[model samples]
Target chain A: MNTLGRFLRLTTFGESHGDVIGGVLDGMPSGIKIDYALLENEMKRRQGGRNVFITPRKEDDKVEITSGVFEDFSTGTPIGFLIHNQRARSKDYDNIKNLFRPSHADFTYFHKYGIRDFRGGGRSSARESAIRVAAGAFAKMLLREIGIVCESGIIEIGGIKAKNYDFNHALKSEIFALDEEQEEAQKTAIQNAIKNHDSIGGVALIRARSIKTNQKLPIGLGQGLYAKLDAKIAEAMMGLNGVKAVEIGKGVESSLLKGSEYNDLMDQKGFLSNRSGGVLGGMSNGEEIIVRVHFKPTPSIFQPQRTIDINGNECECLLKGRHDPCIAIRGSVVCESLLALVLADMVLLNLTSKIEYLKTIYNEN
Target chain B: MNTLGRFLRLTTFGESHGDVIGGVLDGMPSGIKIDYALLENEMKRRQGGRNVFITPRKEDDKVEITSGVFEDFSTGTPIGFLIHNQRARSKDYDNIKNLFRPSHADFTYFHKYGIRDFRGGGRSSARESAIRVAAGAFAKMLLREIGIVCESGIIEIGGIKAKNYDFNHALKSEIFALDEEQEEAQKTAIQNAIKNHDSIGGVALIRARSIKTNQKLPIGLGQGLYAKLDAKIAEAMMGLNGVKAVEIGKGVESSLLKGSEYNDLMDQKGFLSNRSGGVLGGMSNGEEIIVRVHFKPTPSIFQPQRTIDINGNECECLLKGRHDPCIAIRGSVVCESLLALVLADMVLLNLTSKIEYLKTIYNEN
Candidate 1:
């Protein structure tokens, strides 16, 4: 959609159900190792596992990187990645194609373009997340060079409080709960909702580690209008399906306090607290940049729901297909991937000068 | 250039001394009043005024609203603004046009685009800033609704300190010193530098008030692949002539402290301090985001300097028609404009969702 940075920019293209879905990352340094297996794992997470909340459409969604990689490393050019759509239900959607779904783009899309791609909501579908994962993999490669690792987990599902623990611990097990003990119970709860033929909403948390704090950040990061780290990351995650709220560290909590308590008091060491979530003034404070995302219940459920068909007539809609009870489980990776991409762009942007000077600064292979 | 923002995006086009300078802001809410006088004031500040450090070349950089504004209000479409160049020094720069100025883009431009409009550095010229000033004025209109007024000042000039003070007061005196007492000294220093053949550099600080603190900030403002508020802003400012560094909040000072000293704390009252410069975890902490930009000495001076021509031959470069020792003064408006655009985009993106719900959200309006 939008590209950032002078030399390194992340540009995404491809509709959800188009011939393929993908993105292009321009301006990466040459000769960096790439792990496609890691990217495949990320893609799988976005594809949705077999469940009541995730769509049952099994798509291989395998990624193909077209450029900017050589000998398993980046080649300092535009890196293009794509995920082919192995399965599409274009015909099944023909009847309701023109109909405006109560909460979807059926009406708006037709009006905006006069023609609609009835299959999987076109660009609006969650399927577009496939590109996020692929692009994120490359970002991770850049971050890894700086000793930063990103991980995300699901915290709350269907208004249920997920077991509390470190984010890294929750990254494991089904449902991604910090307390594995709650994973089984959470799974049971999800299954029960699935049996009821309904959908549920949930919460997610993303965290980055080893961000050395108490140091000066790059001079370029967030210098002015277009470059606030917080603003950019929130947009990426909130843009996802069913995500209604996104909060940073002590985000809303800051509203409750007066100016005194909220300030990070500097000492000989560093700040006495981490309430700022390891950042101040929209720049990284070398502390982990933590984020919490809230996803609404998936709109599509097998159970009958009120809707208007292709015509204006109101009718009870029955969706016949396998679906995920909670898309957040698989979405954790996608969100992290997007975050990585944002951070990588920031890192490269913060380091270089003119796009041409980039060769000298990033000549390090 | 990279246009940042998921929904409300401002794509800046044209270059300094080029065919046209303008911007396209997509997705502004329909039917909002636009203050043309206020917009022109900001643009005027960036282009006019007699100062020692700014370019003497003068042109009425009047902004023409080509589209989107209806009856002085927005129409919820892409608003286009253009500033046409009426003056040219194409022939004056013809001799050295092909030669690359030291620390300039002569070689880089050729490498990237093969052909470059050598008239006054083409796109890389300070001329592009007029568009930025015009665009920032539009953002100021929206930011005004929330009472966030941005003011910039020179904190350092040629390594000289201009004591910092409140935002508005900083602009009251010559040299834009926050501390009124330091203004005279700074002014005298600028005059003295101008008397010599050399040029000077300065630091500019842009600060804003009335930003909502502690709420869920829009994400993509600083996220996504190759894009984020921090990355974008950094690139924007760094791209400016003579700008060498940017600091957010108590920027470089954090390096001397430990974690506890650098962290901002929060309580029921508010922030205890403002060291973080109004943002945390890459999001606005609802505090005023402060930015510090460092500009280097303008290279074009009366004194002779070593340089390479188009053929890599050493030459003595000297005697520019007219130049400023303090480009940072005019750069202030450009900084404000950029910040305004970023915030506008964030606001628009924060409200992004399924297009079908657009009418419902504003049905009453």
Candidate 2:
């Protein structure tokens, strides 16, 4: 099912453009640190993206964690979160509410609902990514204690490829930049899309680095067929607007290679390279596991496209307002946060699924 | 937190060697065909393998569905399953029960439970996959109406690979074998292990093929960054016993290549190749999504190993009784069933998350 990991389960709420959005994470191990500043930093990164490649519609995107943790520490219960949706221009999106825009979910929304809010794109809006960002941030907090760092970088925009840079460089100096030249190119591409009114798509790379001691995590987290980290991350990133593809390390590139060429060579020292993205056989290999996402063109384009209304009436609908020309820019935090959430879930599931083992491990040796 | 779909949520119960193993799938859609025979066939596949690679300790792994359906049709309620574990041999495992087995979960199991059940590997045993098989068959019945076919196979074992053969062909005539000839080779390998009182590991490949449709799933089944299908499937497969790695479609094999090489080129016809595993950008690209699982060597080997006991004393442990030399054999069906369960959850989550959308999609479309 959507929720994996027995002990640490995470369920999200609120539509993209709903009144408020958040999540409830149940079954966290108690006594773990819950720092507000660190969480806030993650939220800020997920927010503060109002440039050309993004929708000008900015929310405070503040998170109020109501339950589960007590006094900045987890109480080992369900953790509830609330995200306020501010700066919503609902009326601005009211005119063509009944019209089904091309490539937009308007038709499907109307076909399913008979009526829709038609404001800020309703549940399918980018506004909802904030809630995921908050939960992802929480997941990151849980993962950090266990020495897991999930990093992200803008890899591509339109047809331009970002310059090369190492994983460490992307994390330490440039939080979202793979390299300086690519970062500049990404900015220019966004600027170009903003001026043209036509939207574009791009890709982002996310990686989670776990220490050797945490190798058990990948195996544990990747429980059954539904709990694989790469798959989970892919699903999470796909939840974002404009995302068209998700690659776990080599992802699409493996199709052409033979088995021997593709297999990650392992020796006494360690893997020669993390071609498997630090995960072999669905478990983490104590190296950096990478996740890449390809975002599609934004639906809210300035140029008019042909579409149908609720009654099958033909119309030309053109979105007018601040929408992200490329969502990959602001989507990095969402990806990072999801990684954190899944990892935390894996930890809790591993611990709780074998409760007796927790006590046994603690009591013995 | 244990719930998956907003409406149809499936909660699995019982341990590997518990009194009974089953699942509670709440929120099943009404009026769907039960297909008892097909489900029974699916469950049957999870059995067999009495010779090698699978558990010789086979009972009638038959499922008794107590509720949620009537006359071979879903009643739109919680579906209950109960599978009796009547053939347990706990006493044979009593010797050295207190002593932890190396590589086996003995250490972890004893650590978690304090007082442990050593018979048939207790809760950590692959026996739990049986219940998953039953539940998955039921879920697949519902998913089949939506044009989803869940299937799985073994891709690797004992360093040998199962390359070639079609996915559909693997489903029809393979014993979870991708390379037809490897099936015989694997049997020989497992037989050798069984003779030596040792155990080995293998890999499983799973897929969910959805016919090209104009329908778009509603949000809440993890719309962005946590609500996608492949990720859910990956996690489920990885959580299985001895699974060391899990890859979706091209999986880790894709990490070695560059952008142009990996991207799935889509035309008006469809995706050129399903390297992305039928899902592009986390949304179903209306193709067959492929998933591969890597399993490790079985833990319950007859070879003696050194470990510590609860009293902190050194001890020598030799595993006893009949066990599967490779647990991955039974994993194929388990993978298929879990994938169906997750898909059902996603479909139901989309139906019930929002009142407006639910009424429209359910009532109208």
Candidate 3:
């Protein structure tokens, strides 16, 4: 259950407050340059303390590469990386002894099994997604070599929708906002939620484009129905803690259009319209792929709420940990990483379907 | 890329015309009785020539147990099984030398990899799903040890939809028809398509129920977002050759309703209704689970069609040998097996979420 993807699979293991959170990324290609600064920046992008929209739980979140690379290059093996959990404050979690926090996996975990772990290992914690960001760094390296570039920006925050979609400006925004004009208003929404002792949710948009047109892009980068490029993207996005919904390229709006309006008709130059987004029949169509993710408000808040204990008795829940006022800010970074991971897996899997591709890998004509 | 499930993982290996097709089923519990006769019967249910709806291509489809069993009981390791491709008629498939059949994976595959297998191994053939059938048989054994039972029946063929959903009657019907009265018409539809040298599509309904109420049913059988029970089911169903869509328990209909009418509330006795179908937030909720799979028409047809060849020039696609007019009849059987496999994976994974569950397995409590 911990594993995700197929050809470029990643199996993550760890718990919130556990000593370490690490993952093993298998099926990485050989001889790719391992850039330490690039990976560190990716991790820092997902880490907190840089902005108020994120939680105050601060950590260097430095990754220690354990295997699969030598002389700063990959060896086409399982890449093992570990990161120590720095904020394992056990004293603050006595409330988790028997009381189940509202909307947390605590109540259901206890209900399904005969017990629940005192430490937060349930699907309640967003910390596990940190593992994906690490693996995504490796994925982006593979994707970059193939001319694929992925970007994400917060398009909506606490009902504040962005009017413009600028990926470059998002890199400079503290909240990773898509619209420069909407950045201040989005930050104010998070501040208001913090003052009210509550949390807010937002939406993020992810786009993956083949930057170089000279070479053939990853059009066939998808598995059979189960591992469709878009389907796997949904799995990755929805697998997060706060995500309630995931939409792939006008996924919701396409239903309202007719076949003629939604279909992408192609000619010699290329597609006349990309209403089908960048994917057709589950495969990438050499166009920009767009995805929008809807994240629900953070379940954790300071205000005490009515919930149940492990024994099923009514009780008041008190959580005393640094909670995010808006998770979408950091979550947007995780979404980009997960997309990279899925694309990387499909990129590798596509190689097996052809004789010529395998021959090249085997040093044959 | 060929693996399925998380805990009770099954990695399949083989080709359409390969010498053998086999799979390694891991994470299966030890000490379960290995029922050979039952497994053989399940294989026969998916085998062709049992009905006119299936292809004329026939084989014993007998499974050979390679390892992980001792004296008719499981050994808690990877259980390997292999089946010989008895119908490896190389001469009959000479037409596949350079032809790209319409709707086949050949064109897309060749376009993606610069080469396509001479033999049918693309998502073009349904042979790979046979491996799923073998793995599903093993899963059903584990499920039976508990109280869970699964059944799938063909509910629609051509444009015909069954008014009744009778699983027991389906067992007696040669076409696995859910509606007894509609069986003849469904059979006639298959015959009509065969005469026209074309194929038709249909839908299948799968239901999983916990038969015994004395013990706790397998609820919470889902992973965090990525491996939600429903999401995994979609992956499995869509991963098949002809599947295009999958719906879980009023999936499309529920979208058209308001929350008040669709919500499944609860009381001390039990759930007031199962409007949520068996899953709540991706976890099974102790209610009967319902799934609907939509299969596209089989691509293999005798009618010549215009397509591109290996040389990239326009050519006519002329297919030969056996082809099923209606694949749903046999596909319905495969659906039941995959559902069992997913449930079993979750059943084992759910055990690790609690200390008491682990204690029971480790004999420490």
Candidate 4:
């Protein structure tokens, strides 16, 4: 149940304020080189809490690779990792232990099991997303060789929309904003929300390049029909905590078009348009795949809100420090990393899309 | 890639006209009774081609439960089963070995791996669905004790709609129709289409009752967030070969409603109306769950059609008889059974939604 992706399966387990956050990534191909440097760099991006834009909680979130890599090469077994909680202040949550948070999973979760974990929102924490980033590092290790790369950027923060979408400038952006000029505006909105003891929602744009220049986009990368490329992406991306909605390509707007308009006509060279983004007929159509993920404002606002306690008594819900004004900034990091895992899984699955490839892969070895 | 469900996983393997069709169902809870007769009966319904509504391939589809159940009880290991294809007719397919059938996976499958099975549409065949039915029988074994029962019936066939939905009538149905009055109309449509060497599309209704009237529908019967109750159902239901579209509850029609119109206002009795089917907020709300599955006409039509050969030349695609005029009849069998597996997986996964429940189950035992 706490798993994501197929073939390249990732299963994470830990309570929010648990002693440690950890995961196991199964079905990784053997003999692939493990770049420890890239792994640490990925971790740095997610836990880079030095800036004021992120949650002020200070913890290195040091990832300890437990197994699966032997002498910097994968052993083709389940890769395990753990991140010990260094600054988990469970005492801060003691006041709200019995109270539920509005728009949070706490109430439904308690009703479902007749119990609540009240410690750092239990399993529903942003801490768990670090595991995805850690595994994303491994996926990137393989994807780097395949010539596929992913893009992550802040498209909007508290409705301060970006006029330009510079995927490259996002690399240098403190808030991972697509438009550098809009960064100040977005930051001020986030700061104002935090000062007022509130939070703001934002959206992130993620693109998987079915990259053209010298790199052939792998066709048939999806598990056909039901497990379509877009379906898997939606399933994986929606796992994030703040994600309330996810839009793939033209998404909800595509319904407005007729068949003649929605369908991509092809020429001798390539498709006339990419209105369906990169995927056509549920498989990668060798064009750019776009995903716009919508993240709800952080539910851990400092202001008190009315909600029922575990005993069904109406109570005021409040929080202590160490909350992000906007979660989409960090969501971009985790999502940007997580898609590599999905891509890795889909790429590996296509190895058996035919009998010849299945044989050549096994027999040639 | 070749797996289904979260906890109760069924991984199937075999070629279209392969010697044996088999599957491994992993994560079934132990100590459950294995009703061998029920397993065979489920298999019989799938390969039950004795009727004109179904393909006239005379195979008893005897299921051999190889392992997992020892002494009539589950051992908590993966359950394995095999079905020997009694009447292997590779000779029947040799004529159209290189010809691609329109709307079939053959064209795409060939383009995917530079290969074509040329045996029985490769992995894309109705034969693989039998494996799902065999595994579904196992899920039903566990669900039977939980007081959760599934209902299946044909709501429409070849544009002929049913006025009344009689779940029990479907038990005695030759084509598994919901209304006997409409059965004659549907049957004639199916038979006439077959006589003309054409095919017809249809719709089936499968229900997972959060049963009342004595049994309480298991609440919280879904993995929250990304793997939402309905999302997983869509993923699983969409996997069937002939299934082109899937609708849950009000489905497509729900899009036209406002929140006031869409939301089911509740009181002491229950939900005022189950417009969202049996689920609320993506989890079972203790009501009747509905799934409307749409299947396109069987791709293996008997009449000659224009298509491309393996070498990209124009060719005629023809079939040597033996095809279903409407696949929805048998699809109803597989989908009806498959939902049991999804329910089984979600039920088991929810066992850990709370630490107390997790400890109680593991500790008490």
Considering the two chains of model 1, state its CAPRI-style docking category.
incorrect
lDDT of 4 by residue, A60-144 (tens): 5677889998998899999999976555444443256776555455544666766556666333556677788888989988777
For every model shown, what is its TM-score relative to the native structure? 0.52, 0.62, 0.67, 0.64
I-RMSD for candidate 3? 6.6
The digit string of per-residue lDDT tens for model 1 on B1-365 reads: 34644566777764445457777877777777999788766765675344343332345666789999999998988899877666545445324565544334343344334455555543245655776677678777876765566767766665567655755665445455666767777677667667775566667787766644533222223433333344445445544544434456665343223222333443334455656565433334455667766554554555555555545465655545656666666676677677677667655553443454467678745
Give the alpha carbon lDDT tens digit for every residue of A1-365 in model 3: 66887778888774455568788999888999998877878877876335444322264577889999999999998899997655554444225567755434554455665445656432335557678888999999999998888889889877788998999989778889999898888888888777776777678889888777533366677875446666677667755655555556655443233222333434333445555456555676666778777665666677666555645566667666656777778889999998898888888888777666767978964
TM-score per model (chain B): 0.84, 0.85, 0.91, 0.92
lDDT, residue B362, model 4: 82
Better of 1 and 4 by TM-score: 4
For all the predictions, what are the DockQ values? 0.03, 0.09, 0.11, 0.09
- Per-residue lDDT over B1-365 for candidate 2, one digit per residue giving the tens place of the 0 to 100 score: 23334455667664455566767878777898888788667666776433343332255666788998899888988888887756645355546576545444443334333456655444344456666676777788878787667777776666567767456655554346677767678667777777877665676777776553743232223233445555556555544545444556655434332233444443334335555555544445455667766655555666655555656576666666766666666776777777787777667655644576667867898
- Name the top TM-score candidate: 3
**lDDT, candidate 1, at B25:** 73
lDDT of 2 by residue, A136-213 (tens): 666777787877767776676666776685554444333256776666666676677788765666667777766555
- Pairwise lDDT winner, candidates 2 and 3: 3
DockQ-best of 1 and 3: 3
* Order of quality (TM-score): 3, 4, 2, 1
Q: Which ten residues in a row have the lowest lDDT in candidate 2 chain A?
A: A48-57
